[PDB]
Amino acid sequence: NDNITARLDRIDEKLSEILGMLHTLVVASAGPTSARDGIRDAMIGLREEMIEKIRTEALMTNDRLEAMARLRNEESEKMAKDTSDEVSLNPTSEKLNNLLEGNDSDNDLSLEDF
Amino acid sequence: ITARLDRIDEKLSEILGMLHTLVVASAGPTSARDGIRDAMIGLREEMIEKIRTEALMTNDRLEAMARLR
Amino acid sequence: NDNITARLDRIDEKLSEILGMLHTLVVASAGPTSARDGIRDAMIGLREEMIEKIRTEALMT
Amino acid sequence: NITARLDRIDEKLSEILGMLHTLVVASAGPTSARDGIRDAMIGLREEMIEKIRTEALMTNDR
Amino acid sequence: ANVYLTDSYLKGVISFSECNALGSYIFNGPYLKNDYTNLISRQNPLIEHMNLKKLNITQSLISKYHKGEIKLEEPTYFQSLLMTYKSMTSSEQIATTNLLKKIIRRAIEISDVKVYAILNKLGLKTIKTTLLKKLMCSMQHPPSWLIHWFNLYTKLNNILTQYRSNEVKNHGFTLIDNQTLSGFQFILNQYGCIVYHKELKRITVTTYNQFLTWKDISLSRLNVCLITWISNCLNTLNKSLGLRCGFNNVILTQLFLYGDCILKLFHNEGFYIIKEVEGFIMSLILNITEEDQFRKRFYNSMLNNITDAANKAQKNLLSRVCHTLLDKTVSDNIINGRWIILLSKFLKLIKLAGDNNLNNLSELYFLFRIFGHPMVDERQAMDAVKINCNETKFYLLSSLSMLRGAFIYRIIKGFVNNYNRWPTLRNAIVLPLRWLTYYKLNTYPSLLELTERDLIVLSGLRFYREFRLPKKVDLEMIINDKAISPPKNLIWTSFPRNYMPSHIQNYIEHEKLKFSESDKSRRVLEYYLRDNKFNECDLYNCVVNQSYLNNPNHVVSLTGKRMFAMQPGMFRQVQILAEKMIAENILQFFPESLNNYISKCSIITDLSKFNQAFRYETSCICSDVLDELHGVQSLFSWLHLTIPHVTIICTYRHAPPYIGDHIVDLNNVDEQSGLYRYHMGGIEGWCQKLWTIEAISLLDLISLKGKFSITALINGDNQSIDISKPIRLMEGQTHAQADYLLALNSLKLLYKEYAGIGHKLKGTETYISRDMQFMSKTIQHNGVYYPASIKKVLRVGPWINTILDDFKVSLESIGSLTQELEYRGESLLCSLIFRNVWLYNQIALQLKNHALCNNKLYLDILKVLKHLKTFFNLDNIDTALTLYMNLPMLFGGGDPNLLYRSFYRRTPDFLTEAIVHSVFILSYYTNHDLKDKLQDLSDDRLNKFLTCIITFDKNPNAEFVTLMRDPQALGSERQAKITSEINRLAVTEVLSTAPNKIFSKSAQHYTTTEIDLNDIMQNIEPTYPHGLRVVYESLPFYKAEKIVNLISGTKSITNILEKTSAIDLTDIDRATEMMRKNITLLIRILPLDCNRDKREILSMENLSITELSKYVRERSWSLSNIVGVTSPSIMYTMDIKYTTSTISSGIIIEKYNVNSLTRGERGPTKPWVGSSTQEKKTMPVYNRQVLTKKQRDQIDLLAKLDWVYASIDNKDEFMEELSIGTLGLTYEKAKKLFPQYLSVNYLHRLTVSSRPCEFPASIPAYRTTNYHFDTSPINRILTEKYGDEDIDIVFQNCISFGLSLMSVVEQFTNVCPNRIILIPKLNEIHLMKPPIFTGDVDIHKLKQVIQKQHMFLPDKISLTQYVELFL
Ligand SMILES: COc1cc(C(=O)NC[C@](O)(c2cc(C(C)(C)O)c(F)c(-c3ccc(F)cc3)n2)C(F)(F)F)cc2cc(C)nnc12
C-alpha cells in the first residue's frame, strides 16, 4: 500500500508551495498615504509585487534602487563600495590627503588677510 | 483510517487559497477593484470564535487561581 | 498505531491555528469602514459575552 | 517511515506557523489600533480579562 | 517681590531661532535664515526684543547699520574676534598678569599644606615643601597664552558678573558696556546679546546663551592652558608628577585659533567640520594600535567623513545666507575652495599635538567642547529626521520571523537560566517535537546547534502572563523636574503670545478653560502637584484599558535640548512605565544591554540614528512578546501605535510654525519646516531599552547566520560587537589578514541583516577594528587605560553646578570635578594645584561679588579668618585662609576633598576621616611628625582643636530620624546644614497646599510623621544607624522623603505653584542665611575659649582617634552607644614602611611590574576593585516573577530587619506590624519569602544605600594589575588579638590604600617602590561584634507612621498573589 506515501507526497508539495510563498513574501511597513492625509496599512504581497511597487514609485521610499536590490537579494554598487576591501577617497579627500601628506608648508594660507 | 490524512490535503488547499487571498488583496486597487473590496470569505466570525476560545481559555486559568482563595 | 495517530492529531490542531491566523489576516486585510466596524462591534459583543458567562458561573452557588 | 514523514510535515507546519504568527503580529500595526481591532488581531491578555472579570463580578453590588 | 537669577554657565542650548528672531527684528530683515521666525519677529516683535531695539545705544548702532557704516555678521565671526582679543593696554596686561601670578602663588601656598602632610605621612621628605618652592620658581612667570585666556575669561566673567548682580537688583536691567573688553561694545540682557566692534565696523546679534558659551569657551580654553601649564611644570620637575600627557601650549593655541578660523569661514555649519574631527583623532589612535588593513580603511573613511561634512557645510551655508542680511559675509575662501587649506593646517596641528602619543591623543578629546556649541536649528533638525521617518520600509517575512524568533529564544534562554523553567506557553502545540522535548525538560539548545528554521518556529510562540505590572504608581519614577509638553489643544501655549495669530490667541484663552490645572502646568512636577483628581492607580487603569491609544490630546513636542522630545503627562507616564518594566523584568535576560586559528575582529556601530529606522513591523514583533509576558497589550508597542497618529511639532519658544487663518487644530496645520505628521515612530530616548534588546536579538540572529560567535556590548547609543570565528588558516595567509577578512565578511553580513530589518548602515556610522576597544569613550590599548581627564574639568569655575550660587555646593563641585585629574589623570598634585586655583578664586575673588548676597558671604568668611587667626595664633589672614581651605567642609572648612580620597574612594566613616584630615593639616603648623604616634607638643594648636571637637554643649534633636536620613550625621549643630534639610520645611509648606491630595496629605502629616518615626527605635540601646536606615527604607515615609528631597533641590521652592521662573525673596533669604551659617560654622565649632577654660586641653598621649570619633558622634547625639558606623581611618592607622622589617606585622604590597614606573602600564595581577563581601543568605524557593520589583525589595528589606534586629525583645510584634503594614502578609507567611541570612555579623555585610558596596583604590583599575598584596602577616596578628572575631577596620580599604599610595609614591619619587609594608596602629582598631539590641520597638508609633504615609506604600501581596508564589 503506497497510497499513503503518495498522499504524503502531495501534502509535502502543498507545504512546499505555502512555504515558497511565505519565504518570498515581503511586508511593506505601515506608512503615510500619497498626499499624506492618513496612514495606509502594512500591505503584504509577494517579493516581485513589492519590487514593482517600489520600481514604479507606487510606495513612498527614499532609496528606491537599494530597496529593490535588497529584496532581490542582490549586491548593489553602493553596498559593494561601503564594504569594499579598500576604501577610496573622494576627490576632495584626495586633495586633503595630498595636503596632509608632506609637511612642507605648501598650504600657503594667510589668516591675516581674512 | 490512515488515509484520513486526505483531510490535511483539504485544509492545505484552503490554507494556500487563504494565503493567496491575502496576498492578492494588495492588487485590489487600480487593478482588481471594481467596487470597494471584492468578494472574499470575510468570516470575521471565525476570527471572533478563535478570540473567544482563547480569551476564555485564559479566563479559565485566572479563575483556576482565584479558586485557591 | 498510537504514535501515528498522535502526530495526526497534532497536525490537525496546527492546521486549525494556521487557518485561524489566515482568517484573521484575510479579514483584517479588508479595511472598508463596514468590515472594520463589524470587527470592533463584534469585539464589544465578545466582551459582553464573556461578562455574561462569567456572571453565570459566579451564580452556581 | 510514516512517522518520519509526519515529523517533516509537522516541522514545516511549525515553520509555517512561525511565519504566519509573526505576520499577524506585524500586521496588527498602528492602523489596527486606529480602528480598534488590534486586540482582535493579537488576542486578549490576562489583565484585560481580569478587568472584564472584575466588571462581571461587580455590575452593581455584585 | 522676587528676583531673576540667570545662569552663569550654559545649561540649555544656543537657539538658532532665538538668535535669528532677535537679529531679524533689530535689522528689519532675515538674519541667520529666511524662514517664518524672521518674518514673525518683525511683524509682531516680542517686548523683550523691543526693549533692546529701543535702547538709545541700539538705535545709534542701527542707524550706522542702515547707513552702511557697519556690517552685520554671524556670532561665530565674533567668537573668533573675542578669542583673538589682543587689544590689551599695558595697564591691563600688568593688572591681569599680577592677578594671575597672585592666584597661582596662593594656589601653591595652599597645596603646600596637603603636600607637606602627604610627604611627611609617607616619609618621602610661605611654602615649606621643597618641591613646591621649585615649582613656584617655575610658575612665577605665566606664559602669554595663559594670560591671554585668563584675561579674556576674566573680562567676560566680569561682564556677566555685573549683569547678573544688576539683574537681581533690578529686573529687566540691560548691561551696556564698552570698557571692560576694549573695542567690544556689549548689550546684555537675558533675552539677547548685541555685540558691536567699533574698529572693524562690525555688529552681530546673539542670545544670552551664546554669551555664556563665549565665556565657557574662554574658561574651557583657560582650564586647558592652565592644566597644561601646571602639568608641564610638574613634569619638568618630575616626569611622574604631572599628567601622562604633555602638550605644547603653543600648538594648543594655534589649534584653538585655527578652529575659530574654520568657524569664521564656515558660519554655524562650521561646527560640522569640528564635530568630525573626533574621527581624525580616532584615526590617529588607530594608526598606532591597528594593523595596516584596519587603520587604512578607517583613515580613508575618516577623511571622506570630514570632507563630505565640509562640502555639506559649504552647500548648506551658501544656501542659507542666500536671501539674508548675511549674504555678503561669505568668505571667498569658501567659494574658491581654499577652506581645504585651512582644514589641512588645522588637522596637521592636531596631529602635531597628538605627537603619536596615545596619552595626548586621548586627552585631545577636549577639543569638542573647547570650541563651544553650534546654534541649533530646531526646524532643520526636524526636517532632517522627517525624511527617514516618513519612509516606507520593506522586509522579508522570514527576516521578521527570525528576529522575533531570536528575541524569543533569548527570553526562553533567560527564563530557563533564571527561573529554571520555560515561560508558560499558550500555544505549545506549535513546537514540532525536539522543541517540545526542550520545553518539557525545561532546557534549551545552544546557538551552535540551533538553525534558522528553529528561530522561525520559536517566532510562533505565544505566552501567558509571567510578570506583573504595579497597580500603584511609584511617584519616584514619575515625578521629575523637567518640562512637560502641554496637551495637543494647548500646544500653542508653548509660543510667545505675540508670535501667534489672533485666532490662536483667542482660541488659547478658550481652550485653557476646558483643561485642568494639571494640564496647563507646563511642568512635570506641577503636573502632578496640581492634579486634584489624582490617584495611585490611574496609570495602571490607563494601561489596562489602553486609554492612551487614539487619544486626541497626544502631541509630540521637540526642543533643541539633541532634539528633546516631550509628550503630555499621560503619555509620558506610559513611556516611562514601559521602559521601567523592561528594565526590571526583561533586561535580566540581556546582560550585555548594560582550523588552527580563531579569527577575531570588532565592529563598532553608532546606533544614534537607529531609532529612526524602527517601525511597528520591526520592533513590535518583539514588544508583543513583552506584552504577553506582562499580560498586557499595547504597553510595549505604545510608541509605534500612537506616534504615527500625532503631529510632531517643534515647540521651541522662538520657533513657531506658520498657522493658516482659522486653523486651531494642530493636526490640521499645514506641514512645514519644523512641523509634520505620520512619523512612523523612532522617537529618540523613548523605547530605548526595547530597541537595545532588539539589537541584541538581531545580533544573535547574525551570529547564527554567519556561523560565528558574538560577544556584544551595548551602551547608550552605540555598540561594540566582538566577533570570533574558528577558521582554517590558508597558506600564505596571516592572522591580520584572516581577521580583516572576518571583519569584512561579518560587516557585509551585518549590513545585510540590519538592512534586512529596514536599518541602513553607513560607513560614517560603522567602523571596524582588530582587537582594540574604544567604546564608552575610554581608550584602552593592550589593557592600559588612556584617559581623557582634561575633558572632565574644562568647565571648572566659581559657581559651577550649584543652585542659587550655593557656595558650599560649588566648592564640592570643584572638588569632585578636579578629583578626576587624580583618579583618571593619575596626577595627585596636578589635581590639587588646579583645584586650589579655582577654590581660591571661588572663595577669595568671586565670593565678594555674589549675585544674591553681594559681599555678605565674603564678610562672613573674613570673620572666620580673623577667628582662625586668633584661635590658631596665626600671623595673618592670608595664612588663616591658607588653613581654612585645607580644613574639612564637615567642620565648616573650605576643603571638599579629604586626604583619604587620594588613597581610597569610599569610607564608612566621614567623621573619622575629617578628624584625621584635620590632624594631618594642622601638623603643617604644629610641626608634628606624622610618622610617629600622636604626642603632646609645646604647640597646643592641635590639642585646642581636638578639645573643641570633643567638648561642646550637647543639643540632640530628632536624632533617630536624622540618623535614618543620614547614618553618619552628627547633630548638635556640629555639622554644616544642607539644602535637603534647610528647605524641607519650605517644601512641605508648599506641598501642604497642593491640589493633589496625595502630596498635601503627606505633607500635612510630615512633621508628625517625622516625630512618630523618631520615637520608634528610641528604646533600642546599641543604636545602629544603618539598622535604622533599613527601618526607614522599609517605611512609606522614605518615598515621601524622596519626593521632598527632589523638590528641595530646586530654585524658588515657594513659587513652584505660582507658575513663574522668578525666585521668591523668601527662598533667597533662607539660602542666604543658610550659607552664612555654614560659613561661620567653623567659628561655632572652634570657640576661642575652647568651650571651657576649665577643660584641660585633650592630651594625645595614648589617644585613639577612632575612639575620639566614636565619642564625638555619641556625644553629639547624646547616645550611650552608637555602633556599626565608627571605623578607623586606614590612612591614619597604617604606618608606611619602605623596607624589610624584622617582623612583617602588616600588609605587604609588592610591585610585580619589572619596570621602575608602572603608570601607563598593565601588570600580571588581577585588577583590584575593592569588592565588599556579599551577603551570605539562603534564598527560599518561590515564583519570584509573581512579584513586582517594588514588593520584592520590600521583602528583602524586612528580611534584613529580621536579621539585624533578631535580638530585640519585641521582634515578633515589630516584624508583624511591618509585614502586615507593608506587605499585608503575616510574619509567618512573609518569613517564607525572606532570605535567611547565614552571616552572623551584619555590621560589615548588611547592604544599605548608606554603605559602600565596593571600596576601590583611588587609582585606575588597570594600574592595580602591577601590584600584588599579602594581608597574611597582619591577619595573623589580628587573629591572635581578636580571636577570629570581626573588627571595625575595613579590609578592602586597607588593601586599596596600599595600592593607591604606591602610585602616589611613584608620583613624588619618580620611582615605584619594590614593596610597601603597612603596619597598623592596633590601639586604633576595635572589636566589632554584632550587638544585642535590647529594648522594644514602639509599635504604636510604627503603626502611626505606616498609616499617616499609607499613600506611599508599595503594592501589597494579595491572597491571589501569595498563593501563586508556591505553585
Ligand atoms: C564592608 O563594610 C565594612 C567592612 C569592615 C571590615 O572589613 N572589617 C574587617 C574584618 O572584620 C576582619 C576580621 C579579621 C579577623 C580578626 C576575624 O581575623 C581580620 F584579621 C581582618 C583583617 C583586617 C586587615 C587586614 F589587613 C587583614 C585582615 N578583617 C572582615 F572580616 F570583615 F574582613 C568593617 C566595617 C566597619 C564599619 C563601621 N562599617 N562597614 C565595614
Cell numbers for E700: 544573535
The answer to whether the beta carbons of residues E395 and A26 sit under 8 Å apart is yes
Length of chain D: 62
Does residue E819 lie in a domain region?
no
Residues with Cβ within 8 Å of residue E124, at least 6 apart in sequence: E1305, E1308, E1309
Which one-letter DSSP state was computed for residue E975? Answer: S
Q: In terms of Cα–Cα distance, which of E694, E682, E124, E600 is closest to E403?
A: E694
Cell numbers for E10: 550654559
The answer to whether the beta carbons of residues E708 and E724 sit under 8 Å apart is yes
Q: Is E226 in a helix, a strand, or coil?
A: helix
For chain D, report the end-to-end CA distance as a whole number of angstroms.
59
> What residue type is assigned to position E235 of the chain?
N
In angstroms, the CA C3 to CA E579 distance is: 46
In angstroms, the CA C22 to CA E1217 distance is: 56
Q: Write down the residue that cell numbers 601588570 correspond to.
A: E1163
Torsion sign across C-alpha atoms D47, D49, D54, D59:
positive
**How distant is the Cα of E675 from the closest Cα of chain D, in angstroms?**
20
Does residue E629 lie in a domain region?
yes
Q: Is E1216 in a helix, a strand, or coil?
A: helix
In angstroms, the CA B12 to CA B6 distance is: 10
In angstroms, the CA E111 to CA E1344 distance is: 53
Cα E1293 to ligand 1 centroid, rounded to whole Å: 9
For chain B, report the end-to-end CA distance as a whole number of angstroms.
47
In angstroms, the CA E217 to CA E271 distance is: 14
E290 and E404 assigned to the same domain = no
Q: Which atom of ligand 1 is nearest to the CA of E1255?
A: 1
Q: Which strand ranges, in their side-by-side order, compose the sheet holding E596-606?
A: E709-715, E718-728, E596-606, E766-769
Angle at E248 between CA E244 and CA E253, to 5 degrees: 125
Q: In terms of Cα–Cα distance, which of E436, E415, E461, E438 is closest to E621?
A: E461
Q: Is the CB of E1172 under 6 A from ligand 1?
A: yes
What residue's CA is closest to ligand 1, atom 2? E1244
Radius of gyration of chain E from its Cα atoms, rounded to whole angstroms: 33
Instruction: Please report residues of C whose CB lies closer than 8 A to that of B51.
Output: 43, 46
Residues with Cβ within 8 Å of residue E897, at least 6 apart in sequence: E815, E818, E819, E835
Q: Is the CB of E870 under 6 A from ligand 1?
A: no
Q: In terms of Cα–Cα distance, which of E795, E1054, E774, E629 is closest to E220?
A: E795
- To test the contact with chain A by mutation, choose from D3, D14, D15 the residue with the greatest count of A C-beta atoms within 10 A, namely D15
> What residue type is assigned to position A28 of the chain?
A
Cα E1288 to ligand 1 centroid, rounded to whole Å: 6
Strands E766-769 and E1315-1320: unpaired
By the 10 Å C-beta count (0-12 exposed, 13-18 middle, 19+ buried), E443 is classed as exposed
Residues with Cβ within 8 Å of residue E1044, at least 6 apart in sequence: E984, E987, E988, E991, E1003, E1006
E530 and E643 assigned to the same domain = yes
Query: Resolution to 1 decimal, in Å?
Result: 2.9
In angstroms, the CA C61 to CA E109 distance is: 90
The residue of chain B nearest to residue D16, with distances taken between CA atoms, is B15
Q: Write down the residue that cell numbers 499585608 correspond to.
A: E1224
Cα E946 to ligand 1 centroid, rounded to whole Å: 27
Q: Write down the residue that cell numbers 570698557 correspond to.
A: E179
Alpha helices in E1015-1064 (DSSP H): 1025-1033, 1037-1047
What residue's CA is closest to ligand 1, atom 36? E1288
**How distant is the Cα of A55 from the closest Cα of chain C, in angstroms?**
23
Distances (CA, A) of A105 to E21, E265, E349, E1054, E1157: 43, 21, 12, 63, 39
Q: Is E523 in a helix, a strand, or coil?
A: strand
The answer to whether the beta carbons of residues E1134 and E1318 sit under 8 Å apart is yes
Distances (CA, A) of E288 to E281, E291, E361, E602, E866: 11, 8, 10, 17, 57
The answer to whether the beta carbons of residues E1313 and E1298 sit under 8 Å apart is no
Number of neighbouring beta carbons within 10 Å of residue E1343: 15
For chain A, report the end-to-end CA distance as a whole number of angstroms.
96
Cell numbers for E22: 532677535
The answer to whether the beta carbons of residues E428 and E389 sit under 8 Å apart is no
Cell numbers for E152: 579674556
Distances (CA, A) of A91 to E284, E308, E336, E726, E1356: 21, 10, 15, 39, 68
Cell numbers for E882: 591658607
Length of chain C: 61
Q: Is the CB of E81 under 6 A from ligand 1?
A: no
In angstroms, the CA E1262 to CA D34 distance is: 55
Torsion sign across C-alpha atoms E748, E751, E757, E760:
negative
Mark whether E148 is an active-site residue: no
Query: Do B6 and A7 lie within an 8 Å CB cutoff?
Result: yes
Does residue E425 lie in a domain region?
yes
In angstroms, the CA E404 to CA E452 distance is: 12
Q: Write down the residue that cell numbers 492634579 correspond to.
A: E531
Radius of gyration of chain C from its Cα atoms, rounded to whole angstroms: 18
Distances (CA, A) of E167 to E53, E189, E488, E950, E1035: 19, 9, 35, 45, 45
Distances (CA, A) of E25 to E65, E89, E192: 13, 36, 12
In angstroms, the CA E858 to CA E698 distance is: 61
In angstroms, the CA E979 to CA E1050 distance is: 9
Strands E596-606 and E718-728: antiparallel
**D45 dihedral zone (left: phi>0; alpha: psi -120 to 50; beta):** beta
Task: Write out the residue range of the structural domain in which residue E326 sits.
Answer: 244-375
Q: Long-range contacts made by residues E254-258, C-beta under 8 angstroms, separation at least 24?
A: E254/E349, E255/E346, E255/E349, E255/E350, E255/E353, E255/E367, E256/E83, E256/E221, E256/E370, E256/E371, E257/A111, E257/E83, E257/E84, E258/E342, E258/E345, E258/E346, E258/E349
Residue C9: alpha-carbon gap to chain centroid:
19
Q: Is the CB of E1324 under 6 A from ligand 1?
A: no
E420 and E319 assigned to the same domain = no
DSSP E938-972: S-THHHHHHHHHH-------SHHHHHHH-TT---T
Q: Is the CB of E888 under 6 A from ligand 1?
A: no
Q: Where are the beta strands (DSSP E) in E1257-1314?
A: 1267-1270
Q: In this complex, is the C-beta atom of E1276 within 8 Å of any C-beta atom belonging to chain B?
A: no
- To test the contact with chain D by mutation, choose from A5, A9, A18 the residue with the greatest count of D C-beta atoms within 10 A, namely A18
What residue's CA is closest to ligand 1, atom 5? E1290
Number of neighbouring beta carbons within 10 Å of residue D26: 26
Q: Considering only CB atoms, which residues of chain D are within 8 Å of chain A?
A: 2, 5-6, 8-9, 12-13, 15-16, 19-20, 23, 26-27, 29-32, 34
Q: Write down the residue that cell numbers 553602493 correspond to.
A: A78
Cα E1334 to ligand 1 centroid, rounded to whole Å: 25
In angstroms, the CA A24 to CA A73 distance is: 11
Alpha helices in E1048-1160 (DSSP H): 1065-1079, 1081-1085, 1105-1116, 1130-1133
Q: In terms of Cα–Cα distance, which of E618, E622, E617 is closest to E754?
A: E618
Strands E556-559 and E648-650: parallel
The answer to whether the beta carbons of residues E1131 and E117 sit under 8 Å apart is no
Alpha helices in E1176-1282 (DSSP H): 1189-1204, 1211-1222, 1227-1230, 1272-1282
What residue's CA is closest to ligand 1, atom 27? E1275
Q: In terms of Cα–Cα distance, which of E1098, E1112, E1117 is closest to E891?
A: E1112
HSE at residue E585, side-chain half, CA atoms within 13 A, is 27
Q: In terms of Cα–Cα distance, which of E1172, E1128, E1165 is closest to E1270?
A: E1165
Q: Write down the residue that cell numbers 528689519 correspond to.
A: E28
The answer to whether the beta carbons of residues A18 and D9 sit under 8 Å apart is no
Does residue E358 lie in a domain region?
yes
Q: Where are the beta strands (DSSP E) in E424-573?
A: 556-559, 564-566
Q: Helix and strand tally (H, E) in chain C?
A: 2, 0
Could you tell me how many CB contacts below 8 A there are between chain A and chain B?
43
In angstroms, the CA E589 to CA E228 distance is: 46
Angle at E827 between CA E824 and CA E832, to 5 degrees: 110
Strands A44-46 and E784-786: unpaired
In angstroms, the CA E914 to CA E280 distance is: 46
The residue of chain E nearest to residue D29, with distances taken between CA atoms, is E616
Cell numbers for E85: 582679543
Cell numbers for E468: 506583573
What residue's CA is closest to ligand 1, atom 14? E1286
The answer to whether the beta carbons of residues E386 and E378 sit under 8 Å apart is no
Q: In terms of Cα–Cα distance, which of E1294, E1362, E1291, E1284 is closest to E1329?
A: E1284
**E28 dihedral zone (left: phi>0; alpha: psi -120 to 50; beta):** left
What values do phi and psi take at E1288, rounded to 5?
Answer: -85, 0
Instruction: Please report residues of D whose CB lies closer than 8 A to that of C60.
Output: none
In sequence order, what are the beta bridge partners of E184? E197
Is E1196 annotated in a binding site? The answer is: no
What values do phi and psi take at E523, rounded to 5?
Answer: -140, 145
Is E606 annotated in a binding site? The answer is: yes
Number of neighbouring beta carbons within 10 Å of residue C11: 19
Number of neighbouring beta carbons within 10 Å of residue E646: 21
Q: Is E713 in a helix, a strand, or coil?
A: strand
**How distant is the Cα of D61 from the closest Cα of chain B, in angstroms?**
19
**In testing the pocket of ligand 1, which one of E1254, E1275, E1280, E1299 has its CB within 8 Å of the most ligand atoms?**
E1275
Could you tell me how many CB contacts below 8 A there are between chain A and chain E?
150
The answer to whether the beta carbons of residues E420 and E427 sit under 8 Å apart is no
**How distant is the Cα of E1364 from the closest Cα of chain B, in angstroms?**
7
Instruction: Please report residues of A whose CB lies closer than 8 A to that of D2.
Output: 4, 8
Number of neighbouring beta carbons within 10 Å of residue E557: 22
In sequence order, what are the beta bridge partners of E1319? E1135
In angstroms, the CA D5 to CA C51 distance is: 45
In angstroms, the CA E688 to CA E608 distance is: 10
Cα E1278 to ligand 1 centroid, rounded to whole Å: 10
What residue's CA is closest to ligand 1, atom 11? E1286
The answer to whether the beta carbons of residues D13 and E457 sit under 8 Å apart is no
Query: Do D29 and A27 lie within an 8 Å CB cutoff?
Result: no
For chain C, report the end-to-end CA distance as a whole number of angstroms.
45
In sequence order, what are the beta bridge partners of E766? E605
Q: Which strand ranges, in their side-by-side order, compose the sheet holding E184-189?
A: E71-73, E202-206, E192-197, E184-189, E175-177
Q: E671-694: b or e for each residue (b if 16 or more CB lie within 10 Å)?
A: eebbbbbbbbbbbbebbebbbbbb
Distances (CA, A) of E518 to E253, E495, E934, E1059: 52, 19, 63, 12
Number of domains comprising chain E: 4
Give the CA-trace dihedral at E1078, E1079, E1080, E1084, to 10 degrees.
50
Cell numbers for E37: 521666525
In angstroms, the CA E1211 to CA E1231 distance is: 13
Q: Which atom of ligand 1 is nearest to the CA of E1285?
A: 17
Q: Which strand ranges, in their side-by-side order, compose the sheet holding E1147-1151?
A: E1134-1137, E1315-1320, E1147-1151, E1267-1270
Q: Is E192 in a helix, a strand, or coil?
A: strand
By the 10 Å C-beta count (0-12 exposed, 13-18 middle, 19+ buried), E1280 is classed as exposed
Distances (CA, A) of B27 to A45, B22, E393, E1359, E1366: 8, 10, 19, 55, 55
Cα E1291 to ligand 1 centroid, rounded to whole Å: 5
**E688 dihedral zone (left: phi>0; alpha: psi -120 to 50; beta):** alpha
Q: In terms of Cα–Cα distance, which of E326, E73, D39, E1067 is closest to B50?
A: D39
- To test the contact with chain A by mutation, choose from E77, E283, E343, E396 the residue with the greatest count of A C-beta atoms within 10 A, namely E396
> Which residue of the set E1244, E1268, E1326, E1350 is catalytic?
E1244
Cα E1135 to ligand 1 centroid, rounded to whole Å: 18
**D9 dihedral zone (left: phi>0; alpha: psi -120 to 50; beta):** alpha
Helix axes E208-237, E828-840, angle to 10 degrees: 140
Q: Is E654 in a helix, a strand, or coil?
A: coil
Distances (CA, A) of E896 to B3, E839, E887, E1074: 87, 9, 9, 18
Q: Is the CB of E1275 under 6 A from ligand 1?
A: yes
Three state DSSP letters for E680-700: CCCCCCCCHHHHHHHHHHHHH
- For chain C, which chains pass the contact test of at least 3 CB pairs under 8 Å? A, B, D, E
In sequence order, what are the beta bridge partners of E596? E728
In angstroms, the CA B25 to CA C29 distance is: 7
Instruction: Please report residues of E whose CB lies closer than 8 A to that of C13.
Output: 429
Q: Breaks in chain E at C–N > 2.5 Å: after which residues? A: 125, 561, 594
Residues with Cβ within 8 Å of residue E680, at least 6 apart in sequence: A29, A30, A31, A32, D30, E389, E390, E391, E615, E616, E640, E643, E644
DSSP D8-43: HHHHHHHHHHHHHHHHHHHHS-HHHHHTT-HHHHH-
Distances (CA, A) of E791 to E228, E250, E370: 12, 19, 9
In angstroms, the CA E352 to CA E255 distance is: 10
Q: In terms of Cα–Cα distance, which of E158, E101, E10, E168 is closest to E846?
A: E158
E522 and E615 assigned to the same domain = yes
The answer to whether the beta carbons of residues E1187 and E1361 sit under 8 Å apart is yes
E258 and E346 assigned to the same domain = yes
Q: Which atom of ligand 1 is nearest to the CA of E1147?
A: 26
The answer to whether the beta carbons of residues E265 and E333 sit under 8 Å apart is yes
Distances (CA, A) of E237 to E230, E234, E243: 11, 5, 12
